[PDB]
Design a protein around this ligand. Structure first.
Ligand SMILES: CCCCCCCCCCCCCCCCCC(=O)OC[C@H](COP(=O)([O-])OCC(O)COP(=O)([O-])OC[C@@H](COC(=O)CCCCCCCCCCCCCCCCC)OC(=O)CCCCCCCCCCCCCCCCC)OC(=O)CCCCCCCCCCCCCCCCC
Ligand SMILES: CCCCCCCCCCCCCCCCCC(=O)OC[C@H](COP(=O)([O-])OCC(O)COP(=O)([O-])OC[C@@H](COC(=O)CCCCCCCCCCCCCCCCC)OC(=O)CCCCCCCCCCCCCCCCC)OC(=O)CCCCCCCCCCCCCCCCC
Ligand SMILES: CCCCCCCCCCCCCCCCCC(=O)OC[C@H](COP(=O)([O-])OCC(O)COP(=O)([O-])OC[C@@H](COC(=O)CCCCCCCCCCCCCCCCC)OC(=O)CCCCCCCCCCCCCCCCC)OC(=O)CCCCCCCCCCCCCCCCC
Ligand SMILES: CCCCCCCCCCCCCCCCCC(=O)OC[C@H](COP(=O)([O-])OCC[N+](C)(C)C)OC(=O)CCCCCCCCCCCCCCCCC
Ligand SMILES: CCCCCCCCCCCCCCCCC[C@@H](O)O[C@H](CO[C@H](O)CCCCCCCCCCCCCCC)COP(=O)(O)OCC[N+](C)(C)C
Ligand SMILES: CCCCCCCC/C=C\CCCCCCCC(=O)OC[C@H](COP(=O)(O)OCCN)OC(=O)CCCCCCC/C=C\CCCCCCCC
Ligand SMILES: CCCCCCCC/C=C\CCCCCCCC(=O)OC[C@H](COP(=O)(O)OCCN)OC(=O)CCCCCCC/C=C\CCCCCCCC
Ligand SMILES: Nc1ncnc2c1ncn2[C@@H]1O[C@H](COP(=O)(O)OP(=O)(O)O)[C@@H](O)[C@H]1O
Lengths: 54, 56, 347, 98, 459, 99, 49, 320
């Protein structure tokens, strides 16, 4: 009941996936909305697409 | 009060007429799958003197 | 803004998009893009405030950079081919530049930040028009130039768009930012299916436009821009909350609603071309979108949040303005799955 | 392709990089935006004159007109932002967040 | 099948146009009539199924499930009458509409002739269940239960959709008759292993399988009575029906991929029975018993012998009826005392004799008392598992012992002993509740009298 | 306090306002007729009529037909000295092995 | 004895600046209700000799 | 037809209908003064339309039948309870204050709509701009809380940043002892329970904040009781004043069109009065909200739209 069903079966599939998605959402949406920053990101993306794509 | 009875208990025919309509639609769908009627090797049969279709 | 000026600007935006979609000349397509942006900026800046001004400035910068890149790609293609007709581009570098410019115009990752930024900055009608029309045009250009698209780059951008939209929608609370991330994810799906079947691309475009129109018009009807503002709608007009809930369910791809049809058709088309991993990952990633849709639906329809006292006066008064084609868009966004074979008509 | 085209393309790339790397001001961003159009005009006119594309000689004029209209729009937006905030710094454009 | 499908789509407008005080009467009467009409599907052939049209067909496996669904709808209506007294007319009509839509989707799912339509309807059943749970649940955990249920099901089923479209592209058709006649062996390669995994894992998450089952206690505990009745009795059988249908094209790879799932299912029977031994909540006990029975059905389907499919079908029907009856009894006890704790109310045999009799009969049917169809299915599965290997007998024996232990434990805890002194709101049992229990229990004994109707197409 | 919330109402007892309540509805006539229709339809119609219908369903599974055919084949086989059960289901003459 | 419905704590959980608060997000603030931020505020000339 | 962009295109301009007497003469005054009589006198002499002071059943009056609704369905507050127990623990004081502010906002919207649709001036006994004096008086005495004051300030900002300023603080300056004498003579016990400190706080709020604030925007005409008795002098002073005060001189046809579109839509007017700020005084539980809404829908002529209620005598429903 406690060790398997309530702890580890909850930890493997639903809790770990939820934690990963929450961390990724925080990382993605933690932007400060600075045009300089994301235009520099645009420049990096442009260079990567021009060079490492054949 | 007869109108009030009809005005309140007219919903009790919906399911029966739906059942009748479903039976009619089942027959109409069965009439579209008569490609092998009286043509199967197992049930091929000469028609009776007063008969045109083995089944409907 | 004067009503005549407003309708003139709207017609100018529509005429620019129509010129883009009917022109066979790269110069004319670029002219249409320029006209569209020029007439679109005041629509964003209709309701004047610092946030709207900032959103318009960011949108102008992004669209101007994209237009410069697109014109550079056109010139490079002209250098090596001497052709102005919009066909399969004859230079890989020009094709890459054109693809990047069109992705920047659409909002595909990693060119996505301006989409939530501008959508939050501008009002509901401006966001609706922005999403719908400004994604309608570059998708037409991409469909015209589909046969030269680099599948690796296109699919990479599409998958990035799907993932970024899912995670952003997971973390956001503002309705307009949620809509922006939903738009990003759906554009990712469309561009993923683009290099294989432009008919499937157009079908996804139509379904997404219908669902987005329904959702935005419901939000305008309820006059809600945040989660808690929408949480009070059940105490004034519970029908709108239920319609919004079914629309949110449809946008999540749940069968047997209309939103499942684009995903289903795209999966079928991609798996026809011996592509399994990409459809599997795309299908699994939509669960994030469905999660934040369901979280939004909990606060508005399936539960009853606390209300206020002036809601009694709200009950006493009645909505006046009537939305155009709202019931039609609600029906078309939830009950057209049995009419799927019409994609042959769309072909 | 000769080296003049190489130099023009390099100038366009440098102008694009300058636009994508802000320092303090929005005016410099508009200046970098206008340099890209200058490079595009030079490249287009060189290509058209080299190949004797007679009917294409009107394209650079249209490009210049539309880009100048875009520049006017950008200047209007810049002066509105400056009137709102006090400076044309791009740091002030942070009310909206991703 | 239209003669059964159309009357439900007529139940909808009848419900929405009936008077405010006649909705329950009309819905119950016409649901009973539809069940009587659907009883005609039990006249199955011996060699091939009943092919009504290009879209719908009925088999010896589909017919008992359709009859069970059509019979289960009016009982859910009665339970809803019980717990929805103070609801408004529009919300009551919406609840009835959700139940009717769920029944219609289940009927079409069971009678679908193609795998893609089967998938579409089998996923369409999610929406009404989620709405019912998250809207008419009583406690805070209903939202979490709905999220867990929906996401477990979808994470299971999306690779199934990918596999189905791939199979159609590869072979030509997803029609069940064609994929059965034109079946070809599945080679032992990684691609075939992953296709097998996609299909089987989808249906196992739906089943559920041990380790993928937490959504079942979460949803069944927090759902209303009608939701719990439909979740345990019919919605759990979608996975079993799918596995019995989808395994036609997965041989002989099923002979090699079945080991992890067989071990999981048997050890899950043991673990879930042991969990039932020490549960402080009655609904959780019933949910874990359902998990154990479904694990036994999984074992039968995976070993995949003619004696195991008959046992699987019989056990599915019997478990559906028994779990519905147990949930109804637990809901009556809850509605009396407004708490799901099992040791809170005692002496219920002294206070309510007839309910004590119903509890005794339900608990006897749960522990597979002969000659009940529960025991028939369990014994067939045990014999097939014994033929498969000779330690499955040990596992089944210990599972059966623990099952009897926890069934009689819950019976003794709830009904026997000294009544709680401070609980003085135990009113006499209602005629509605007694009739609900009788309508649950009598078909079980009638199917015991005539067992060949629920033994599947391999009889 | 945090809200202007109604207190939790006491649960109503159907037997207080109607000692003859069947538990279906608080209206006496509606409750009585709900009980009557449920009992009549469900028990009488469904149980009795469906049970006898299933009991007297025609033998479409061909169990008795199979028994009669088996009796005929057994009689013919043991009358002529042939084995009761054939060695092969199909004809080796019609089957062509790869060689 | 009645169905549970969300309360002020649930509404406050759902009514922050963003879900899943962190240090920076807690430093952030929700936007104004009407999306109009408060403002943050002649030429003199001495002529003659 | 209904006013809108099509009417504006056709040529229905607001400045065409405006005249010299098209003035929103809000008459700001004090408690229990002759402001109501003075406003009625001014309205008749100048030909303007008089709006009685806004209230709970004023908000109830404009919609449906003019008869007021039950206090449970509308307002959920009473002035008598505020008089009897100002510091009660149910938040009735701030609930009443917020409801009265909403009612005054609705009344101001109605007055603006009437002025912009007919050209006739309007006389208001009190407006949203002078409503904050009661809130300050309550806060000084400790009847309400700082959180209530902050919520009121937020709502007032977001809802009154849109509309045009009032026209005159006709401050009928009556000393507090005279106010108490008038209250005692009137004989209503609930208002007789009003303390002297509460009356002084209202006068302090008027004279220290509202009077200086409105002096910059427009002219302020202050009169004593005896001066306010002579309404002709007040009318003469009103007609005399002329200057470039207020945004009215710079108001344009497009701005008037936008304002008319705003004020003709009542739900847009009362949009930010229900912002999701969960103060215990104004927050209503889900179950109580559901029950009260069900009762309000069960009201006779309010289940459907006004033209679609058969129980109150609406015909041709199937063709409407
Ligand atoms: C981890 C420890 C472990 O391996 O435990 C095995 C053990 C099963 O006992 P077993 O029979 O000894 O294991 C397989 C045999 O060793 C060897 O069996 P085999 O030789 O007959 O070959 C069969 C094998 C063929 O091998 C492969 O297919 C290898 C490639 C696998 C690719 C990835 C599969 C991804 C999807 C898995 C399900 C996700 C949900 O099949 C698999 O590997 C199937 C893996 C998935 C089984 C179902 C898991 C359901 C969820 C369990 C609870 C989770 C919480 O437990 C599990 O499989 C569940 C572990 C949960 C953690
Ligand atoms: C059918 C009966 C279904 C259950 C009873 C429902 C009615 C009821 O409440 O009766 C008590 C109640 C007794 O009167 P009371 O004193 O007022 O009631 C107070 C207590 O409730 C009185 O309760 P109590 O505790 O004094 O006794 C009530 C009785 C009621 O409990 C039962 O009847 C339980 C029976 C099922 C046990 C669990 C399932 C196991 C699998 C059995 C499958 C057999 C199917 C056979 C075909 C059935 C076709 C319907 O329970 C027992 O006797 C204890 C359990 C006895 C188990 C015996 C051994 C069972 C396993 C072996 C069976 C072998 C049979 C085949 C042999 C083959 C080879 C020859 O009965 C009536 O009032 C009867 C009047 C109405 C009857 C229906 C209409 C009849 C006319 C048409
Ligand atoms: C001359 C040629 C004919 C012109 C006919 C239109 C009326 C012109 C006269 C007039 O009253 O103008 C003022 C009138 C509104 O004046 P206003 O007072 O400044 O507007 C305040 C609000 O923005 C008014 O917006 P709202 O917040 O009251 O309502 C939202 C409104 C907002 O509508 C707009 O902002 C205009 C439409 C924007 C695009 C809408 C989505 C299009 C999706 C297309 C998908 C692919 C196909 O959207 C809707 O009501 C529904 C949108 C369309 C749904 C159906 C789309 C498929 C058909 O102008 C319009 O309604 C614009 C019409 C533009 C038509 C262009 C035809 C080419
Ligand atoms: C694909 C999605 C991967 C998401 C990884 C992620 O964010 O993990 C969280 C973690 C951060 O989680 P964390 O910082 O909260 O971890 C704390 C862990 N405890 C409390 C146990 C000490 O991110 C990483 O580990 C970075 C992974 C980078 C990519 C690696 C490949
Ligand atoms: C009194 C104590 C009772 C409890 C203890 C039990 C002790 C034994 C009691 C035994 C009583 C019955 C003995 C006499 C039985 C007579 C009837 C029996 O012989 O007929 C059975 C038949 O019974 C019915 O088939 C049972 C019907 C079961 C289905 C009822 C469904 C009703 C709707 C409910 C839907 C529930 C859905 C569940 C999933 C399907 C067996 O079939 P069969 O002998 O050969 O039929 C003969 C007709 N022939 C010759 C032409 C073939
Ligand atoms: C597969 C490669 C593609 C990579 C992307 C994978 C996308 C698909 C996997 C994600 C599954 C979608 C569900 C998870 C979405 C994010 C959920 C989340 O935000 O977790 C935090 C969330 C925060 O909840 P709040 O309402 O904010 O506060 C209350 C806290 N109790 O925590 C929760 O408790 C929510 C419960 C969600 C769990 C749902 C169950 C998930 C089941 C997964 C089964 C395995 C899936 C396989 C992958
Ligand atoms: C879970 C983690 C692992 C699964 C992640 C899914 C991402 C895809 C990874 C596996 C992809 C397998 C694959 O693409 O090949 C399968 C094969 C490809 O072969 P072809 O190229 O077309 O032709 C033969 C070439 N010689 O295609 C198929 O068989 C169709 C079905 C493949 C679908 C992908 C399988 C998905 C895995 C199913 C696991 C289900 C887990 C359920 C989660 C439950 C959570 C509660
Ligand atoms: N914002 C408010 N808050 C609390 N009470 C108010 C508010 N506005 C008006 N009132 C109450 O309404 C009443 C109005 O009385 P009033 O019309 O001044 O009397 P008279 O008609 O004799 O001049 C006052 O007693 C005052 O307490």
């Amino acid at each position: 009941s406690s060790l398997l069903d309530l702890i580890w079966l909850e930890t493997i599939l639903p809790k770990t996936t939820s934690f990963i998605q929450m961390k990724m959402s925080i990382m993605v949406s933690n932007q400060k909305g600075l045009i300089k920053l994301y235009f520099l990101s645009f420049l990096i993306t442009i260079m990567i697409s021009m060079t490492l794509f054949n | 009060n007869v109108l009030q009875i009809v005005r309140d208990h007219w919903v009790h025919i919906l399911v029966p007429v739906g059942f009748v309509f479903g039976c009619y639609l089942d027959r109409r769908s069965d009439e579209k799958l008569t490609a092998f009627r009286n043509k199967s090797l197992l049930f091929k049969r000469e028609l009776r003197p007063n008969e045109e279709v083995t089944w409907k | 803004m004067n009503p005549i000026i407003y309708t003139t600007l709207i017609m100018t935006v529509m005429s620019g998009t129509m010129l883009v979609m009917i022109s066979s000349h790269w110069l004319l397509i670029w002219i249409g893009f320029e006209m569209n942006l020029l007439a679109m900026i005041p629509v964003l800046m209709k309701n004047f405030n610092p946030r709207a001004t900032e959103a318009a400035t960011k949108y102008f910068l992004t669209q101007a950079t994209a237009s410069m890149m697109l014109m550079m790609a056109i010139i490079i293609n002209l250098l090596y081919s001497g052709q102005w007709t919009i066909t399969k581009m004859f230079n890989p570098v020009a094709m890459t530049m054109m693809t990047m410019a069109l992705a920047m115009k659409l909002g595909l990752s990693p060119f996505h930040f301006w989409v939530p930024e501008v959508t939050q900055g501008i009002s509901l009608q401006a966001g609706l028009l922005l999403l719908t029309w400004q994604k309608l045009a570059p998708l037409s250009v991409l469909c015209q130039i589909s046969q030269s698209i680099n599948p690796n780059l296109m699919l990479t951008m599409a998958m990035l768009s799907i993932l970024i939209g899912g995670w952003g929608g997971l973390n956001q609370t503002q309705l307009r930012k949620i809509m922006a991330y939903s738009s990003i994810a759906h554009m990712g799906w469309m561009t993923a299916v683009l290099p294989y079947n432009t008919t499937m691309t157009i079908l996804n475009l139509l379904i997404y436009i219908t669902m987005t129109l329904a959702m935005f018009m419901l939000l305008i009807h309820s006059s809600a821009t945040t989660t808690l503002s929408l949480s009070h709608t059940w105490n004034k007009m519970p029908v709108i909350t239920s319609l919004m809930m079914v629309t949110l369910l449809s946008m999540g791809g749940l069968p047997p609603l209309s939103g499942f049809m684009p995903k289903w058709m795209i999966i079928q088309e991609m798996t026809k071309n011996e592509s399994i991993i990409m459809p599997t990952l795309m299908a699994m990633t939509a669960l994030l979108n469905l999660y934040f849709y369901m979280r939004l639906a909990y606060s508005s329809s399936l539960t009853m949040f606390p209300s206020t006292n002036n809601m009694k006066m709200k009950w006493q008064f009645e909505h006046t303005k009537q939305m155009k084609l709202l019931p039609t868009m609600i029906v078309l966004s939830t009950l057209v799955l049995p009419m799927t074979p019409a994609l042959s008509s769309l072909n | 392709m000769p080296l003049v085209y190489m130099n023009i393309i390099m100038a366009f790339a440098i102008a694009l990089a300058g636009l994508l790397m802000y320092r303090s001001h929005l005016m410099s961003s508009l200046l970098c935006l206008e340099g890209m159009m200058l490079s595009l005009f030079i490249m287009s006119t060189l290509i058209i004159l080299n190949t004797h594309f007679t009917l294409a000689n009107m394209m650079p004029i249209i490009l210049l007109v539309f880009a100048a209209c875009e520049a006017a729009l950008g200047l209007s937006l810049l002066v509105m932002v400056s009137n709102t905030y006090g400076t044309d710094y791009v740091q002030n454009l942070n009310l909206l967040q991703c | 099948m239209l003669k059964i499908i159309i009357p439900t789509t007529m139940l909808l407008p009848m419900t929405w146009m009936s008077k405010h005080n006649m909705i329950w009467i009309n819905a119950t009467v016409h649901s009973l009539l539809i069940s009587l009409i659907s009883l005609s599907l039990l006249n199955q052939l011996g060699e091939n199924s009943l092919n009504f049209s290009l879209t719908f067909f009925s088999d010896s496996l589909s017919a008992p499930l359709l009859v069970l669904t059509t019979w289960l709808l009016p009982l859910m209506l009665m339970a809803s009458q019980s717990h929805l007294s103070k609801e408004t007319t529009t919300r009551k009509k919406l609840y009835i509409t959700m139940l009717i839509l769920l029944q219609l989707f289940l009927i079409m799912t069971f009678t679908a002739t193609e795998l893609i339509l089967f998938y579409i309807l089998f996923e369409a059943t999610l929406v009404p269940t989620l709405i019912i749970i998250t809207r008419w649940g009583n406690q805070t955990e209903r939202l979490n239960a709905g999220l867990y249920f929906l996401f477990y099901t979808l994470a299971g089923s999306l690779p199934l959709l990918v596999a189905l479209v791939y199979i159609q592209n590869t072979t030509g058709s997803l029609n069940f008759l064609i994929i059965h006649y034109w079946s070809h062996p599945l080679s032992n390669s990684w691609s075939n292993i992953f296709m097998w995994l996609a299909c089987i894992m989808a249906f196992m998450v739906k089943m559920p399988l041990y380790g993928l089952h937490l959504w079942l206690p979460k949803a069944h505990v927090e759902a209303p009575i009608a939701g719990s009745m439909v979740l345990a009795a019919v919605l759990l059988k979608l996975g079993g029906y799918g596995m019995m249908r989808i395994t036609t094209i997965l041989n002989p790879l099923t002979n090699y991929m079945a080991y992890p799932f067989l071990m999981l299912s048997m050890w899950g029977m043991i673990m879930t029975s042991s969990i039932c031994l020490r549960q402080t909540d009655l609904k959780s006990l019933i949910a874990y018993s359902s998990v154990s029975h479904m694990a036994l059905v999984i074992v039968a389907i995976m070993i995949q012998t003619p004696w195991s499919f008959m046992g699987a079908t019989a056990l599915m029907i019997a478990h559906g009826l028994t779990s519905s009856m147990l949930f109804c009894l637990a809901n009556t006890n809850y509605e009396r005392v407004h708490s799901r704790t099992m040791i809170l109310a005692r002496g219920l045999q002294t206070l309510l004799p007839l309910m004590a009799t119903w509890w005794l009969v339900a608990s006897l049917t749960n522990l597979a008392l002969p000659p009940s169809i529960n025991l028939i299915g369990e014994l067939f599965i045990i014999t097939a598992s014994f033929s498969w290997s000779n330690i499955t007998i040990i596992l089944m024996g210990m599972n059966m012992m623990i099952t009897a232990l926890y069934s009689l434990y819950m019976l003794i805890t709830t009904q026997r002993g000294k009544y709680t002194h401070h609980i003085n709101n135990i009113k006499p049992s209602f005629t509605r509740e007694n009739a609900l229990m009788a309508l649950h229990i009598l078909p079980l004994l009638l199917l015991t009298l005539n067992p060949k109707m629920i033994l599947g197409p391999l009889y | 306090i945090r809200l202007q919330e109604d207190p939790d109402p006491e649960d109503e007892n159907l037997y207080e306002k109607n000692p003859d309540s069947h538990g279906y509805d608080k209206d006496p006539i509606v409750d009585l007729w709900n009980m009557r229709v449920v009992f009549f339809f469900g028990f009488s119609i469904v149980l009795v009529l469906g049970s006898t219908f299933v009991a007297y369903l025609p033998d479409y599974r061909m169990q008795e037909w199979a028994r009669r055919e088996a009796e005929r084949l057994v009689k013919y086989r043991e009358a002529n000295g042939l084995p009761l059960m054939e060695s092969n289901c199909f004809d080796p003459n019609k089957i062509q092995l790869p060689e | 004895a009645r169905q549970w419905q969300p309360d002020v704590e649930w509404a406050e959980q759902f009514g922050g600046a963003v879900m899943y608060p962190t240090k920076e997000t807690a430093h952030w603030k929700p936007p104004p209700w009407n999306d109009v931020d408060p403002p943050k505020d002649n030429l003199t000339l001495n002529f003659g000799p | 037809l209904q006013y809108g962009p099509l009417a504006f295109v056709l040529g229905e301009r607001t400045t065409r209908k405006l005249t010299e007497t098209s003035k929103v003469i809000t008459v700001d005054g004090n408690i229990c003064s002759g402001k109501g009589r003075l406003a009625r006198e001014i309205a008749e002499k100048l030909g303007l339309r008089h709006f009685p002071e806004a209230g709970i059943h004023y908000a109830d009056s404009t919609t449906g039948d003019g008869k007021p609704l039950d206090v449970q369905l509308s307002g959920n507050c009473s002035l008598e309870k505020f008089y009897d127990d100002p510091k009660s623990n149910d938040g009735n004081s701030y609930r009443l204050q917020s409801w009265l502010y909403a009612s005054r906002l609705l009344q101001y919207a109605d007055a603006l709509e009437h002025l912009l649709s007919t050209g006739q001036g309007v006389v208001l006994e009190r407006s949203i701009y002078s409503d904050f004096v009661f809130l300050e008086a309550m806060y000084r005495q400790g009847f309400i809380r700082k959180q209530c004051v902050e919520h009121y300030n937020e709502v007032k900002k977001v809802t009154a940043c849109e509309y045009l300023p009032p026209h005159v603080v006709v401050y009928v300056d009556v000393p507090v002892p005279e106010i108490q004498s008038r209250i005692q003579k009137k004989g209503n016990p609930h208002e007789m329970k009003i303390t002297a400190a509460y009356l002084q706080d209202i006068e302090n709020a008027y004279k220290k904040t509202f009077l200086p604030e409105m002096s910059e925007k427009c002219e302020v005409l202050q009169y004593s009781a005896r001066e306010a008795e002579d309404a002709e002098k007040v009318v003469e002073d009103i007609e005399y004043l002329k200057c470039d005060k207020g945004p009215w001189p710079d108001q344009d046809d497009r701005t008037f069109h936008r304002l008319r579109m705003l004020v003709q839509n009542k739900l847009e007017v009362l949009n930010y009065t229900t912002i999701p700020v969960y103060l215990p005084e104004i927050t209503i539980g889900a179950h109580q909200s559901d029950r009260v809404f069900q009762k309000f829908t069960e009201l006779p002529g309010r289940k459907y739209s006004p033209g679609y209620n058969e129980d109150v005598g609406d015909k041709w429903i199937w063709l409407k």
